[model samples]
Target: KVFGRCELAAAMKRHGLDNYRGYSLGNWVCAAKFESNFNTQATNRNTDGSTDYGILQINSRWWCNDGRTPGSRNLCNIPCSALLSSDITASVNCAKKIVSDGNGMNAWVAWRNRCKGTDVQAWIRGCRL
Candidate 1:
């Protein structure tokens, strides 16, 4: 099962991502909802055969290691399994790297597709900050 919205919000807050780089906590919360519904074990195959891993769906092509994709940049430098951990530490740090590069959530198609420009407040509604 996926993590609850409030649960993820608290986790992000603990990691100091709630307001990092001018992004609101709502932004990451909404993006994770669309990406994998906060599912730590989520994985998806893209048309190009690259895989997305974990809650934020970090891509194998660029972010995480994938045995099937040889020579991938694997910028996160961790096994794909690490991203699937319930702890969410490695996953969060890698995502923070992506956002720090001025890409923001653009690294996630989920953000551009369903989460962008929407009312982000509802995503965190009733979640204790």
Candidate 2:
């Protein structure tokens, strides 16, 4: 499923990403914009052979069990396939775990390169959240 910017913002807010780990909803929206463009089934393979899954691009090496990534920690204890679902509930939960794990949004390089230290408010400007 693909989401409009506002729709994605509202969804993230509903899932409690707003103010999560000191990051605002705009930050999350910005990351999503650069990470997956709000695509629920987005998957990216890293140079290290780990794969990122879903809208938030949860990593296969440390978060979800893809059964293909060697030495997967599977900290989220979910199958990588779960992250591809359009429902987004599983993706949100996994993202929360990632943030709480002392990584914050830094787990996503897109956030560091594009969202961090920037006025991300534009990401959610038109959203009625």
Candidate 3:
């Protein structure tokens, strides 16, 4: 669950949920719960015990392929790559873009309809809708 939260929040931020004057820390929490129930340290452990890293649960293998770094064909180091950014705002906003295919706000609507905005405490308090 922790892993789920990290991945969801990162995805939300990547999409634009972190956009200027538009993001709510509460909303971000809500979105994370909706996506992964707030699992920050969660990891995908196969029966074979392979490990994936970081708060956002970015698979190092897929992520290692560059575009984010000038020449990092390998995954960005945890906290350094995923946790560290210009600021929480910049990090989340960048993450929001990645989460959304230029459609950050859509996540809210989907969560609203599917979950009825009930499970996420942050949503109950933070959403504009």
Please report the candidate that would top TM-score against the real structure. Answer: 2
The local lDDT score (0 to 100) that residue 88 gets in candidate 2 is: 85
Model 1 misplaced regions, further than 4 Å: none
Pairs of colliding residues, candidate 2 = none
Tens digit of per-residue lDDT, candidate 1, span 1-129: 479889999998899887788778888998898899789999998888889989899988888787887667788898888999989899899999888877777878888888778888787788878
Over 3-122, each residue of candidate 2 has an lDDT whose tens digit, in order, gives 999998998899888998888899988998899999999999999989999998989989899989997689998999999998888999989998898878888999999899999998
**Pairwise TM-score winner, candidates 1 and 3:** 1
Q: Provide the TM-score for each candidate, comma-separated.
A: 0.93, 0.96, 0.35
When sorted by lDDT, best at the front, the candidate numbers are 2, 1, 3
Q: For model 1, state the Cα shift of residue 28 in Å.
A: 0.7
By TM-score, how accurate is candidate 1? 0.93
lDDT of each: 0.86, 0.91, 0.42
Task: Please give the ranking of all candidate structures by TM-score, highest first, separated by commas.
Answer: 2, 1, 3
Between candidates 1 and 2, the TM-score winner: 2
Give residue 119's lDDT in candidate 3 (0 to 100): 46
Q: Could you tell me how far off, in angstroms, the CA of residue 18 lies in candidate 1 after the best superposition?
A: 1.0
> Ten-residue segment with the worst summed lDDT in candidate 2?
98-107
For model 3, state the Cα shift of residue 120 in Å.
Answer: 7.7
List clashing residue pairs in candidate 1. Answer: none
